[PDB]
Design a protein around this nucleic acid. Sequence first.
RNA 1: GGGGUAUCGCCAAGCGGUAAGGCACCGGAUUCUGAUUCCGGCAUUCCGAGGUUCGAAUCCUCGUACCCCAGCCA
Length: 529
Amino acid sequence: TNFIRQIIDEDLASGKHTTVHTRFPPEPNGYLHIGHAKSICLNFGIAQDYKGQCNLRFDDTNPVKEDIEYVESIKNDVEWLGFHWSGNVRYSSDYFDQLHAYAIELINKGLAYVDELTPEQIREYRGTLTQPGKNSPYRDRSVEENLALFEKMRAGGFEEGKACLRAKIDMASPFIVMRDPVLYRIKFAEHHQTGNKWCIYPMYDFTHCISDALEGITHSLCTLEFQDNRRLYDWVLDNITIPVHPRQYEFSRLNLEYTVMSKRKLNLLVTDKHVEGWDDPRMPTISGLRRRGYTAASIREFCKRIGVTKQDNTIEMASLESCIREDLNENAPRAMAVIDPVKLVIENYQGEGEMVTMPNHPNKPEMGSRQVPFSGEIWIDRADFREEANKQYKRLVLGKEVRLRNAYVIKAERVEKDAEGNITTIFCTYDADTLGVIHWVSAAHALPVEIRLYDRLFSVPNPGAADDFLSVINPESLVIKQGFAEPSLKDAVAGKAFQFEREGYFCLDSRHSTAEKPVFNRTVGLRDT
RNA sequence: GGGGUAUCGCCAAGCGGUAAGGCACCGGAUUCUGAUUCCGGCAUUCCGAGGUUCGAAUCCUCGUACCCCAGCCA
Ligand SMILES: NC(=O)CC[C@H](N)C(=O)O
């Protein structure tokens, strides 16, 4: 439960509503990020719980900022998250004729007029946060004139910015949004849905409340910054001939530590090529989280966990990680991979190799087991061998033994280094029958794999607050490695993740994995303490 | 000016009855993954200062802090 569901309840109880109809109206001007997932879960979830309906609407009123790639991606992420919208996908543009009709109603009612103040003049007449605005000298034209003028605008008769339709409200309102808000502006730009049919487009404030009412929305859910706008939302509806009046309720938007959560800043990263694209695994986009190996369900749980309030918040990365870790911990089948390898030769070993049995999930036998190839020339992780080091160190030391994961116990005896004194191979003996603990990979049957270790995009907790958020990017947000995985992974499915034992959860694809060179993305590392 | 929000490090219940929960954190137990699991611990206090009440985080008052608004963006 949350404040919004309590309102909904009271409406249902009072009889003000007998059904609930919500909506997710992003503008198709960028890819969806996790903040939008909060909104999708909120709106689509309320619908299903209250046995109602929730539409997917593309708030497409600004042609110059939108693209068809985005509408396609949005529909894709919404689906991927696991939600279904009510009926067809809607578009604000579906109402362009209705909106133009309604603007004509406001004009006929004397509540709208065509202003000729330049875009600079409008701001100048607008007033300040503390000084009232002032009336345009064109504010009192007749209905007849406004009608003619608006038609002229609509017919491509005015150059851009040369005129616009403004609402006639109160230029001295403390609500700056109510100071004659612009209803229509001229843009000779082709729209991704209406092509070149219109040269005039409606503004957000005029469009949204009307789109909401036409679609029969009962509870319009948005974020805190449209609180002031709710006044214009109501004004518009209160002043036109429309049978319903949806009510807007605002909740705080999501802020995630170490990243930005606004399409504008995410676009800059894509545009400036500091990430591969909107779906880069380091990106907080739904596509990027998906490509990183995150499950729709872990995201759904994150949104459930964070809540919906009016408090400005900033969630910690540990919260999101917790969610994905919980999921993958339960479901990911375990595997063996070595991110940083060094060859270890069991001189004691005789043969061409053998096959040891390995559980697909050390705590869930029902998930079965598999046969993994063992031998005398395996691969271990460099950090798992210490010629020296403290008593706490539970891994391989130059005179100590260690249990090879699901195999035998071995003993390091003679190391071998190179020119720069770096070790090249470790010589050990194995106890013919012995079956800390360390993972390994038989060099002979090993599959060469590229491993991508992801990390926080930015060096600071709140990069969006920085003057130049880009200068504070983390140069180690992506560190690529070349390791070895058990041949098993030869059939790994893109997107699906496994737990690389003692390392973390990894998934294939990355838009890079080929048959020859597989690319594994580390979704999240295990809890190291 | 106006609109909003202030409860444990980060989220978050609580709507007059005397502070849920999650994340994180600190112990301990297990464990062929230093993971998982498993127990135990973690606000005598709710931005502040008064006030009303038998009694408030929950009501009033005066303050303080932070967020949002001056796109022909959404
Ligand atoms: N009122 C709202 O839900 C805002 C919709 C607007 N298109 C947005 O993406 O923020």
